[PDB]
Structures are given as structure tokens and as C-alpha cells.
Design a protein. Structure first.
Ligand SMILES: Cc1cc(-c2ccc3c(c2)CC[C@@H]3O)cc(C)c1O
Ligand SMILES: Cc1cc(-c2ccc3c(c2)CC[C@@H]3O)cc(C)c1O
Lengths: 243, 11, 234, 11
């Protein structure tokens, strides 16, 4: 039970050290966008990010203690939320734009090139704007991302030992809550301000869930239209949600 | 069977 | 805004006093249900509950201070989350069942009577189990339901709403401190409660797609009001 | 026009 023994500072260091890299797209700016081509860039990127995410998850404290079936379930439930919070995080310092890749920074007008993407685009922008006005810190971001991984599928997990798995996940979640409060108290916030900011951060996770639900319906729509190429992994992740 | 299973397995 | 001047105890009293009533189903005694009969009962009940929800929202401290259009936006975004958290709340004392109304208590097998309903039933039952395991208190429940109302649509519009949300946070911590929870237990419970709101959001979006599918399947006519709330998500 | 508008303005 390595996750339970970490201090707040050791939790942050572990999560910071596990951060996946920021990947590049194949975007060539010497030609104008199109609906199919732009979405192909984004799905190609998401597929490559997914591989790094799966290996990041192994490094989130407690995740390795779970069964393979339960690791699969949590990632199947959370993967788009996790891609989206990552996107919103690296877009924080780019008001009005989404930084999909260092070489791919789009405003909402270019996102209109895809049908139905503009609503999701606007929601992601609003989330990035909210992180900016809250001045979200990198230490807080990695905590939130790990909360999404452990929380989003846990309520859809029979057995007395089955309760041990959920209870262990909830104890890890509890440890991450401890870690968030630690960071805020170190930043000088009063007790009142700590609880307020904790709530503000966790309430954003409701909006990230919403965006992921909408994005998954849009992904299924792309699959049906069979115009944008979707990778075998993306299709398996998508099918796990339409079960 | 799932790719995700394999990537989670792979060492 | 009068809401920001309230003590935590005054906030709790106001929210408890605002609570809508528990309505009955049409007293159809015919068992079992068909798809169309269960859908009829549930949509008729949802439609009447919506009218009471709108009048409850007016009594949530701080909600009347918003403009009409902002009130409309928040209710259009959150209405099914609010119906669902209310259903889960009243089903807490009926483990393994959903108390849609006092005379309409259903188990998961009855969820199968409607195509696509059993997945949503299972998520609602899971939420009720989580509430029970946490020993969620009625005072905590009314705080969470008001948080949903103010929070769910606020990122698709602000400062006044976030201040009221902050006041409800203060009120949740106050309740836990009164119950003897230590500081560490207080912020842990606050997080546990608020993380369930992400699952309620998921259930609402799944339920919204299911309602849209029942609309397209056209098993039962939905009320104009239910259709207007549904259309705000499409 | 919205039913929600009427319900919110009425008692
Ligand atoms: C709507 C939508 C968005 C995305 C998505 C979301 C976030 C991110 C990327 C793609 C690539 C960079 C960033 O991590 C994927 C699919 C399948 C979608 O259907
Ligand atoms: C038709 C339908 C109804 C409902 C539903 C109906 C009524 C009520 C609630 C949910 C919560 C309490 C209230 O009694 C949900 C879905 C997904 C539906 O498809």
C-alpha cells in the first residue's frame, strides 16, 4: 500500500514526475483547414495521447493496487475527461484558444469547421477561462486529474472484497483531498478559503464530466459518419461507453 | 482481447 | 443579495423550508407494467414534479437575485440532475429499490420493462447506496441539490453565483463541524459529497439521451414542458 | 416563448 504512506509533498512529487509529455500533431499550416482533415489531426493526436495516458495511470498512486478489470473500467470511463482536462490545462495561458498541440492553437472560429464541435469547443474554452480566473496551480491540476481517474468509474463498480476495492479507491481519493488542502494551506489560504477553493475545483469536475459525455456522443457520431479515421483503440474506448 | 487490456498488461 | 448575509443555520433552515412535496403516481394498480404504462407513469410524474421544482428554485436563497434568463439557463441545464438527486434521496430507505413515488416503488427488474432503462436504474441505485453508506443527512442533501442548481449551468454562460456557491460550501462544513467531525474529516467528507455530483451529471446526460430516444420511439407523448426542458439539451 | 418563463414569473 504505497499510496497510503505518501505524504502530501510526496504525493505531489509522484504525480508531477508521472506527467505525460505534450505531443505534436501533423498539422501543416501552409494549407487551410477542412472538417475531415482537422478532425483527423485531433483523433490521431488523441490516439497517441491515449497510449501515454495508459502508462501515466500506472504511476498514479494506488492505481496499480487495483485489479486489471478495475483498471480497464476506470480508464474506459475517464479517458476523455482526462484528455480534456489536460487540453484545458495547457490552454490556460492562451485566452480564447485551445492548445491542442504546441503547433496547433485554435480559436472557436476554426473549431466551427466541424459540425457540432463548436459547442464542445466553447465549453472547453469556458473551462480554461475558469482555471485562469482561479489561477489553478500545476500541483492542483495533477491532483484533479488523478481524482478524475479514480472517481469517474468508481460508482459503477457484489462482494465483501469488492467493497475493499472501492474502499481502497476512496481512501486514495481521501489522500488526494488531503493533498489539495495541504497545498492551499501552504499558499496562505485561511481554513475558510481552503474549503471554498476545494469545492470550486471539484465542482469543475462536474463540467468536465458533462463535456466528456457530449464529446463521446460526438465521437460516436463521427464513427457512424465514417469519414474521419478513428484508431482501433479509440473505437474500443468509444464502444466501452455505448455498452 | 481489448487493446487497453494489453497496454495495461504490457511490460 | 440577501443570501450572502445568512448564517449557515439560516441557510439550512431556508433550504429545508423550500423543499418541494413528495408527489404520488397515478394510482394505476395494474401489475406488471408495460413499456408504455411505465413510461406514462414516469413522464406524468416528472412533469408534475418539474412544476414544483421551478417553485422550489425560486426559494433557493440567491436564485431570485438572478435575471430571468439566467434562471432559465440554470434550470434548463440542471432539471434532470435535480429530479434524479431527489429520487435517489427518497430511495435511501429502500435499498435495492427506487421510490419514484410512495405508491410507485420499483426494483431493477422492473427497469427492464423499458428499453434502455436498466442502465439508468442501476446508476441511480448505486447513487442511493453511496448516499446510504455515507449516511447523507437531509441538511447535506438540500445543500447539494442547491449546488447542482447553481453550478451545473454556470460554465456555459457569474461572480454572484460563485459567491452563493461559496456560501453553501461554508454551510456544508458548518453542518459537519456541528456533527463532531474533525477538520480532516470535514474536508474529506466535503470532497466525497461533491464528487458524487460528477456521477449525477453523468446520470442526467445518460437519462437525457434515453428521454430523447423515448421521444423518437414515440411510445408515449411527452408534455410540452418536458419537451421544452429536453429540447434545451439538443 | 417558454413555459419555463411563465412558471418562473408566476407563483
Ligand atoms: C470532441 C472530441 C475531442 C477530442 C480531443 C479532446 C482533447 C484532446 C484531443 C482530442 C487531442 C489533444 C487533446 O488532448 C477527441 C475526440 C474523439 C472528440 O470527439
Ligand atoms: C421517461 C424517463 C423518466 C425519468 C424520470 C422520471 C421521473 C422522475 C425521475 C426520472 C426522477 C424523480 C422523478 O419521479 C428518467 C428517464 C431516464 C426517463 O427516460
Amino acid at each position: 500500500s504505497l499510496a497510503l504512506s505518501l505524504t502530501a509533498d510526496q504525493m505531489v512529487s509522484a504525480l508531477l514526475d508521472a506527467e505525460p509529455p505534450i505531443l505534436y500533431s501533423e498539422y501543416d499550416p501552409t494549407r487551410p483547414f477542412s472538417e475531415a482533415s482537422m478532425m483527423g489531426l485531433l483523433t490521431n493526436l488523441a490516439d497517441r495521447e491515449l497510449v501515454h495516458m495508459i502508462n501515466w495511470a500506472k504511476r498514479v498512486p494506488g492505481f496499480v493496487d487495483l485489479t486489471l478489470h478495475d483498471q480497464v473500467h476506470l480508464l474506459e470511463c475517464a479517458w476523455l475527461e482526462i484528455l480534456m482536462i489536460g487540453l484545458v490545462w495547457r490552454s490556460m495561458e492562451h485566452p480564447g484558444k485551445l492548445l491542442f498541440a504546441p503547433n496547433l492553437l485554435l480559436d472557436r472560429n476554426q473549431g466551427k469547421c466541424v459540425e457540432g464541435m463548436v459547442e464542445i469547443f466553447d465549453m472547453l474554452l469556458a473551462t480554461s477561462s475558469r482555471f485562469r480566473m482561479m489561477n489553478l496551480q500545476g500541483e492542483e491540476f495533477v491532483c484533479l486529474k488523478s481524482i478524475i481517474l479514480l472517481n469517474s468509474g468508481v460508482y459503477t463498480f457484489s462482494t465483501l472484497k469488492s467493497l475493499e476495492e472501492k474502499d481502497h479507491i476512496h481512501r486514495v481519493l481521501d489522500k488526494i483531498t488531503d493533498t489539495l488542502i495541504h497545498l492551499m494551506a501552504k499558499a496562505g489560504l485561511t481554513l475558510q478559503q481552503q474549503h471554498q477553493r476545494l469545492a470550486q475545483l471539484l465542482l469543475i469536475l462536474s463540467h468536465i464530466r458533462h463535456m466528456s459525455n457530449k464529446g463521446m456522443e460526438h465521437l460516436y457520431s463521427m464513427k457512424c459518419k465514417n469519414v474521419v479515421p478513428l484508431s482501433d483503440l479509440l473505437l474500443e474506448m468509444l464502444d466501452a461507453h455505448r455498452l | 482481447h481489448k487493446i487497453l487490456h494489453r497496454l495495461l498488461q504490457d511490460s
